[PDB]
């Protein structure tokens, strides 16, 4: 029955920017609203309760406001460590509905071209009749890349899987791409390459049996 409609779906803002996230309750919930911060791999952390009360340890750049139906979470001066998904929740009326979340990303941080490390198939894997090349892409910003693979000089698209870039630190991303081959395909070419495009420029690494 009761809904908590949170907005926007996501936002990207620079370090030092003021960011605002809103939530609309479908009925009057007075000040019975809480806000949480959720980072990948970690449990949600309580930031705010009673709509505007900051929990122990929470930096003062976080503030909440509103009462009745309209609620706002404000971050006055966005910091790199604020990269997370934020959730509103109303907590008095069953079933204590959470909003759908707002993903906050940081833009405008120093740009960095990727490093590319390409690992050949291990001898153990080849002996198990399998082969995987692992392309490890690191220390890049912003966190968008595209990956292309080559067998000798020509494109290979079969057998490729690539991760979505993950933030490794307050400032850099990593990503992985995998090329699955047969041991015969691996051994029969002069080389294979992983070519990473980042902001219109490429870094390519090559391996050979």
């Amino acid at each position: 029955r009761i809904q908590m409609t949170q907005s926007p779906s996501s936002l990207s803002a620079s370090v030092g920017d003021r960011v605002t996230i809103t939530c609309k309750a479908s009925q009057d919930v007075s000040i019975g609203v809480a806000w949480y911060q959720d980072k990948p791999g970690k449990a949600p952390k309580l930031l705010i309760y009673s709509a505007s009360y900051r929990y122990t340890g929470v930096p003062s750049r976080f503030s909440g406001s509103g009462s009745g139906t309209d609620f706002t979470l404000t971050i006055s001066s966005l910091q790199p460590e604020d990269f997370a998904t934020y959730y509103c929740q109303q907590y008095y009326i069953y079933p204590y509905t959470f909003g759908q979340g707002t993903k906050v990303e940081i833009k405008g941080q120093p740009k960095a071209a990727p490093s590319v490390t390409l690992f050949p198939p291990s001898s153990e894997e080849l002996q198990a009749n399998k082969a995987t090349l692992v392309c490890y892409i690191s220390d890049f910003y912003p966190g968008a890349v595209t990956v292309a693979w080559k067998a000798d000089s020509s494109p290979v698209k079969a057998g490729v899987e690539t991760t979505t870039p993950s933030k490794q630190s307050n400032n850099k991303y990593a990503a992985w791409s995998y090329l699955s081959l047969t041991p015969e395909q691996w051994k029969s070419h002069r080389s294979y390459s992983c070519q990473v495009t980042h902001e219109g420029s490429t870094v390519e690494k090559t391996v050979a049996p």
Partner: protein
């Protein structure tokens, strides 16, 4: 401080049953209300159930009534969530949490446990070394790693040297392959001279198959 520790996650077949537990410490267990809250992929947070550790009386969200049972063991400060008639839609990270009185906001949370509801079999990983060499060395820093292939369900965890090695470690999210199995890798960068003086071992834990693998990664 306050601690909440879950156990019980893993793979369950559709229609099956699974019991989670939460071990609480660092507060008067009977002074508070205990909860479970879940986070499904793509979906946000959903409160599941709460229990009064005194009476044992429980309240459930609509979709869990008659299906889930919350219970407590006062003597070992432990809460039990018994889940029956599970569906693919119940795949989620399950958290135990704490609230006070009629304010159902949660100041303390457990670490979460991932429950995957699927008709596929569990499958432990095949772990292969990604050997350091001159070809993976740049500016005197060598990259080495481990490739954790073909497992199901998530998750796997990876540490290095039993947790003694943490700086320069990058452990990637998993990829889902066409085979329906996951793979991930962990890569660590270290000084080239350390390849002769330090042993490097990746410690892989795949709790859903009760499998641990410690793979020595040797230079080649």
């Amino acid at each position: 401080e306050v601690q909440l520790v879950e156990s019980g996650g893993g793979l369950v077949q559709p229609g099956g049953s699974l019991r989670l537990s939460c071990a609480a410490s660092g507060f008067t267990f009977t002074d508070y209300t205990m909860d479970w809250v879940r986070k499904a992929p793509g979906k946000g947070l959903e409160w599941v159930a709460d229990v009064n550790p005194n009476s044992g009386g429980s309240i459930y969200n609509q979709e869990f009534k008659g299906r889930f049972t919350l219970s407590v063991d006062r003597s070992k400060n432990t809460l039990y969530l018994q889940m029956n008639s599970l569906r693919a839609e119940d795949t989620a990270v399950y958290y135990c949490a704490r609230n006070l009185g009629p304010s159902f906001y949660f100041d303390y949370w457990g670490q979460g446990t991932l429950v995957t509801v699927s008709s596929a079999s569990t499958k432990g990983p095949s772990v292969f070394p990604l050997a350091p060499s001159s070809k993976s060395t740049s500016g005197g820093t060598a990259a080495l790693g481990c490739l954790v292939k073909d497992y199901f369900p998530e998750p796997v965890t990876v540490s290095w040297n039993s947790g003694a090695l943490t700086s320069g470690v990058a452990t990637g999210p998993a990829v889902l392959q066409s085979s329906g199995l996951y793979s991930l890798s962990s890569v660590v960068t270290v000084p080239s001279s350390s390849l002769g003086t330090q042993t490097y071992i990746c410690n892989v834990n795949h709790k859903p198959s009760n499998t641990k693998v410690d793979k020595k990664v040797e230079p080649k």
